[PDB]
UniProtKB/Swiss-Prot annotation, chain A:
Chain intervals for the UniProt region annotation (DHBP synthase): 1-195
EC number of the protein: 4.1.99.12, 3.5.4.25
Organism: Mycobacterium tuberculosis (strain ATCC 25177 / H37Ra)
Entry protein name: Riboflavin biosynthesis protein RibBA
Biological-process GO terms, alphabetical: riboflavin biosynthetic process
Function: Catalyzes the conversion of D-ribulose 5-phosphate to formate and 3,4-dihydroxy-2-butanone 4-phosphate. Catalyzes the conversion of GTP to 2,5-diamino-6-ribosylamino-4(3H)-pyrimidinone 5'-phosphate (DARP), formate and pyrophosphate.
GO CC terms of this entry: cytosol
Similarity-based family: In the N-terminal section; belongs to the DHBP synthase family. In the C-terminal section; belongs to the GTP cyclohydrolase II family.
Positions contributing to D-ribulose 5-phosphate binding: R28, E29, D33, R132, P133, G134, H135, T136, E156
Protein residues bound to Zn(2+): C252, C263, C265
Binding site for Mg(2+) 2: E29, H135
Cofactor binding summary note: Binds 2 divalent metal cations per subunit. Magnesium or manganese. Binds 1 zinc ion per subunit.
């Protein structure tokens, strides 16, 4: 049913000081936030935002920015702020724009603002949508992904067909069309970040003697999980990188460790190792979606052939799916 | 032997604003920390501590206070109160730094590095996760119903002055000053018999190469890894126990710079040759906790290594 603009558009529009619309995913009942980068707030833009939204304007901020300004500290009423200098009553699109710009600017300090005001700063979790799939996080992410300050400006879009309510997905689609805006999902943003940012790093490297010969064992960690995955590497991979034999084997405790007979997992790792070792060149990934994909590209794999019995945007070429004995 | 006070007494003593003395166990060779609750730090109390300890004052903290103040994330870090103290060394001043680390409303900007107080970060779970004097301090503080922040320092020997006081003297010292002397072992036991601390996550009937085992997933409420327990027969005296540390290289990939693989196998088999036994796969604080939950009172331990406060008694030690 629903068609979405790409993340590549959203970043570029954000970078150009234009606004985008963000929904969580494809579900038709979703409300949408209109979003621009706080440091791109002009009177024209804020006035546009105020026109079509609830008018309860928010400024999603990076933890680092929050702490510099003594705001929303990591450890009931809503905290609001107004720029202390350069504004009038603090409610017009200009004043609100000045406030947003000020929050974004890396030089500004606590007493450059007065509490209360007409702008709601919000605290985005460290690491963006990957750690918390909220509109707040998407706003800081988009700003940062566009090479700007990790400061965004958001407010929800009211409906026009049903006066009483907030716009849902289908109406946001035409709103986005009519006004030349991108409409994107947090879902699409999450997985774009997963496919275009390196979240892995090498921790350890050892060469291990086995029954199947020596394997180069490289340990990898994820910046977004507390686990070492290990890739076992035979021979030279890059210079080349093509036609690499690969097995991706997700960890099975009962199977791999205890030799459980009611699963073929254990036998399969061993067979994969054997096969790779016979070919004198390959990769058996021991995994504990594909973070494994990023490991492969880090290993200099360009084109591969997967070892598997069951018949992506990473620059990995699947050539032939091939059985384990 | 050597008389020990109850934990029940130690906790009430902490709550009252008094101090206690803590050792590991009944062993004559042990050194002892003097401990009170950080929030209960007075000039009188700190002065008492400075008098009889090495004067190297430490404040064990709950990881939450550590993060909250930005000290010791995961050179010796020291700290002093920013306001309301003089040079820092005096009992009054040092008492103030202790009190202010213990307070929930104090912030990073309330303190100055460097200072005259060593803040220590206790492991999550206190003594049930690490049997240290540092963990003992927050545990007592918390059990007393106060902020999880304590203060410790070791007691210098009065009899042999170049040295730190050992068990004998520590009891004498407690008697002298009307303080409670307790062991970490006795602290562990109070806790584990009083608190939820370990859970069963799953059970299954793992059919191995050496017959059939009953596989049981244990988790600690302080860490989110799941250890597996492989049990044969009914468990609870004289059981053959092997506690095996995960070794990915060796257990899984059959590395040969390692020998861990053929070890786990040998254990499973040896336990199988007998109708009875436990093989723990750990991914031994939590280890012990699991064994008592299985219902082990005594055990023959499979290890190649000599030298508690849980239920367990090591009957013998068996190799290979
Ligand atoms: Zn399996
Ligand atoms: Zn090993």
């Amino acid at each position: 049913m629903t068609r979405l603009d790409s993340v590549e558009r959203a970043v570029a529009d954000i970078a150009a000081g234009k606004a985008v619309i963000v929904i969580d995913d494809e579900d038709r009942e979703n409300e949408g936030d209109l979003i621009f980068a706080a440091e791109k707030a002009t009177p024209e833009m804020v006035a546009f935002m105020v026109r079509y939204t609830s008018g309860y304007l928010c400024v999603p901020l990076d933890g680092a920015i929050c702490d510099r300004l003594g705001l929303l500290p990591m450890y009931a009423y809503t905290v609001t702020v107004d720029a202390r200098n350069g504004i009038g009553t603090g409610i017009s699109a200009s004043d609100r724009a000045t406030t947003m710009r000020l929050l974004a600017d890396p030089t500004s300090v606590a007493d450059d603002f007065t509490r209360p005001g007409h702008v709601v700063p919000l605290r985005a979790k460290d690491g963006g949508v990957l750690r918390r799939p909220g509109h707040t996080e998407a706003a800081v992410d988009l700003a940062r992904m566009a090479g700007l300050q990790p400061a965004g400006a958001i407010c929800e879009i009211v409906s026009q067909k049903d006066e009483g309510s907030m716009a849902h997905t289908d109406e946001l689609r035409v709103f986005a069309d009519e006004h030349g805006l991108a409409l994107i999902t947090i879902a699409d943003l999450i997985e774009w970040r997963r496919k275009h940012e390196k979240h892995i790093e090498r921790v350890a490297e050892a060469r291990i003697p086995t029954r199947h010969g020596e394997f180069r064992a490289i340990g990898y960690t994820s910046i977004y999980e507390d686990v070492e995955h290990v890739a076992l590497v035979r021979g030279e991979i890059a210079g080349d990188g093509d036609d690499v034999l690969v097995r991706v084997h997700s960890e099975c405790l009962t199977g791999d460790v205890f030799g459980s007979r009611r699963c073929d997992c254990g036998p399969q790792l061993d067979a994969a190792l054997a096969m790779v070792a016979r070919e004198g060149r390959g990769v058996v990934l021991y995994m504990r979606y594909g973070i494994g994909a990023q490991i492969l590209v880090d290993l200099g794999v360009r084109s591969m052939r997967l070892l598997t019995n069951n018949p992506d945007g990473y620059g990995l070429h699947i050539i032939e799916r091939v059985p384990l004995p």
